Amino acid sequence: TTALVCDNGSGLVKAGFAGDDAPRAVFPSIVGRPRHQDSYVGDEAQSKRGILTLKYPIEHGIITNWDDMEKIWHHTFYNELRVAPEEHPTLLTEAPLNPKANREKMTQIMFETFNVPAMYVAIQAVLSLYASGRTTGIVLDSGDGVTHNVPIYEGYALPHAIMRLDLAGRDLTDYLMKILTERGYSFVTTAEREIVRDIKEKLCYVALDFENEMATAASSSSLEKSYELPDGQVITIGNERFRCPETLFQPSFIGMESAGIHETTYNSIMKCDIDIRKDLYANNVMSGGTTMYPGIADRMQKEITALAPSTMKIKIIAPPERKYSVWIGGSILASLSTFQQMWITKQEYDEAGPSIVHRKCF
Amino acid sequence: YNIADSNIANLGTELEKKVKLEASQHEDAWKGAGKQVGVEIWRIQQFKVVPVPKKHHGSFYTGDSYIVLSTYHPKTNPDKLAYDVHFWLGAFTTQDEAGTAAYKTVELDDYLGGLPVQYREVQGYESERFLSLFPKGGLRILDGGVETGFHHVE
Ligand SMILES: Nc1ncnc2c1ncn2[C@@H]1O[C@H](COP(=O)(O)OP(=O)(O)O)[C@@H](O)[C@H]1O
Numbered sequence: 001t002t003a004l005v006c007d008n009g010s011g012l013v014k015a016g017f018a019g020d021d022a023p024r025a026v027f028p029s030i031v032g033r034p035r036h037q038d039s040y041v042g043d044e045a046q047s048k049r050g051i052l053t054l055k056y057p058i059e060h061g062i063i064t065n066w067d068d069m070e071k072i073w074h075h076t077f078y079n080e081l082r083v084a085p086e087e088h089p090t091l092l093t094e095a096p097l098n099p100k101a102n103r104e105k106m107t108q109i110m111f112e113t114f115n116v117p118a119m120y121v122a123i124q125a126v127l128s129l130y131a132s133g134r135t136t137g138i139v140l141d142s143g144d145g146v147t148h149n150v151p152i153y154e155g156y157a158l159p160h161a162i163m164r165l166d167l168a169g170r171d172l173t174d175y176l177m178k179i180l181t182e183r184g185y186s187f188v189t190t191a192e193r194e195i196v197r198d199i200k201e202k203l204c205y206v207a208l209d210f211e212n213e214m215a216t217a218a219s220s221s222s223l224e225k226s227y228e229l230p231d232g233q234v235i236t237i238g239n240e241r242f243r244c245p246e247t248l249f250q251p252s253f254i255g256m257e258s259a260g261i262h263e264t265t266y267n268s269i270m271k272c273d274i275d276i277r278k279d280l281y282a283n284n285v286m287s288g289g290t291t292m293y294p295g296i297a298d299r300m301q302k303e304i305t306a307l308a309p310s311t312m313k314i315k316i317i318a319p320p321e322r323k324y325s326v327w328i329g330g331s332i333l334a335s336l337s338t339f340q341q342m343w344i345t346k347q348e349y350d351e352a353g354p355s356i357v358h359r360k361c362f
Numbered sequence: 363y364n365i366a367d368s369n370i371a372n373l374g375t376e377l378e379k380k381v382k383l384e385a386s387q388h389e390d391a392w393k394g395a396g397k398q399v400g401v402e403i404w405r406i407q408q409f410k411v412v413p414v415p416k417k418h419h420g421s422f423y424t425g426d427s428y429i430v431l432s433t434y435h436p437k438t439n440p441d442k443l444a445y446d447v448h449f450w451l452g453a454f455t456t457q458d459e460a461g462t463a464a465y466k467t468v469e470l471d472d473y474l475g476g477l478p479v480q481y482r483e484v485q486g487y488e489s490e491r492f493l494s495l496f497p498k499g500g501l502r503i504l505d506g507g508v509e510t511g512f513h514h515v516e
């Protein structure tokens with residue numbers, strides 16, 4: 001019996017089999033329907049986006065369209081992995097600070113619609129920490145939604161210090177779409193959002209000193225890069241390369257009054273007992289696609305240094321595989337019989353209903 | 363935020379500890395562990411926690427990950443037991459081994475009621491306490507190690 005591991009991101013499904021070193025299916029968490037007013041899912045929706053309007057059933061880690069989410073899960077099982085879900089214990093994941101009803105309904109659908117024999121819902125950042133070989137540290141997880149900070153001590157997340165920011169990769173894509181209009185380019189539709197997402201992933205970076213970088217960009221063309229669009233048109237981008245992810249550090253770029261990711265990391269550490277803070281500062285683990293910008297770890301190092309006590313030893317850990325760290329941690333834990341012992345069984349669900357998820361999954 | 367309405371409302375509770383204590387009862391490696399002063403060592407082998415024979419204690423394969431439980435008498439009572447649990451990560455250990463060693467360290471901590479203090483020991487970065495566990499010449503690093511438990515996705 002092989003367990004399935006599915007990390008349902010806001011942007012991408014990462015799915016596969018426990019014991020594998022990587023997810024075998026990674027595809028967009030999207031359902032497409034004809035732009036002219038039946039549906040397509042994942043890679044195929046992306047391929048035919050020319051005639052489709054694309055919708056993400058998850059926003060900021062919360063499922064907002066349950067019918068489309070069911071389509072995503074069905075596609076994951078039957079079309080991608082090509083498994084019968086009633087044969088496989090299944091590990092799912094979730095962002096922290098979600099409303100409790102999200103995982104209740106995940107549990108209900110998995111048992112009542114997909115008939116899984118057993119399942120568990122894990123907190124993403126905890127999986128990332130184990131993937132890094134640690135029991136103590138503070139995870140900064142940022143995907144296509146929900147940037148979160150989770151400090152963990154001796155294997156237990158510290159709930160009073162968990163922080164969440166509903167600002168992540170999708171917001172950065174949308175902001176790049178907006179600022180590319182200043183250059184006279186027009187990216188507006190859901191299909192165009194996916195093009196801009198690709199430009200962001202290929203060409204953006206975090207400046208070490210934002211104001212200096214802005215001056216460099218005005219002094220010459222040294223920071224410019226070109227990008228070939230699907231129709232063959234070649235565009236040029238300049239200071240947008242680093243203004244886009246600067247939003248992580250300055251959420252006011254999109255009109256949010258929130259603390260940026262450096263100050264939120266610092267605030268999370270400061271909510272923890274003083275005697276463990278040195279270990280958290282020395283073990284800041286980044287996970288998720290929005291932590292992949294070149295320069296982000298060095299900028300984090302600089303900004304946390306400026307906030308922390310002057311002698312504090314600070315280290316940012318940025319695993320090269322961190323787009324998949326949550327999934328990998330799940331693959332490891334789901335390979336352990338004692339972890340599976342905690343999973344909700346079909347009989348437990350039949351007798352207790354969705355409430356059981358809160359009594360078993362931590 | 364509203365922790366109480368959220369999926370983290372039951373973190374930090376006695377219920378969380380109870381469930382994890384129960385899970386730890388399902389690992390044969392912990393039966394009998396921590397019953398007397400000394401050092402007990404296990405190596406991760408394809409996700410399993412496997413005892414290391416006493417004659418090898420202090421020799422560690424650079425390709426592997428280990429859990430080392432040091433049971434000792436605390437200053438407060440010479441007839442009681444306290445615990446340091448070290449997980450040692452070889453310079454060449456693979457991600458499945460280090461992640462399992464981390465998770466199973468937490469599990470042994472649970473099994474022993476939370477009392478063990480955890481120490482992460484990467485090869486070349488071992489703490490003063492870890493260096494003090496083995497007699498003169500006792501700490502030795504060996505070439506090689508056991509194969510990863512992961513299947514490689516091409
Ligand atoms: N190299 C990169 N630079 C910046 N952002 C990236 C990069 N690679 C992926 N992303 C962004 O990361 C997000 C997807 O990452 P992922 O961790 O899978 O998110 P989720 O778990 O929310 O689906 C998207 O916003 C994507 O554009």
Ligand SMILES: [Ca+2]
Pocket residue numbers: 425426427454455456459507508509510
């Ligand atoms: Ca090995």
Ligand SMILES: [Ca+2]
Pocket residue numbers: 154471476477478479480
């Ligand atoms: Ca402990």
Ligand SMILES: [Mg+2]
Pocket residue numbers: 008009010124142143144288326
């Ligand atoms: Mg994610």
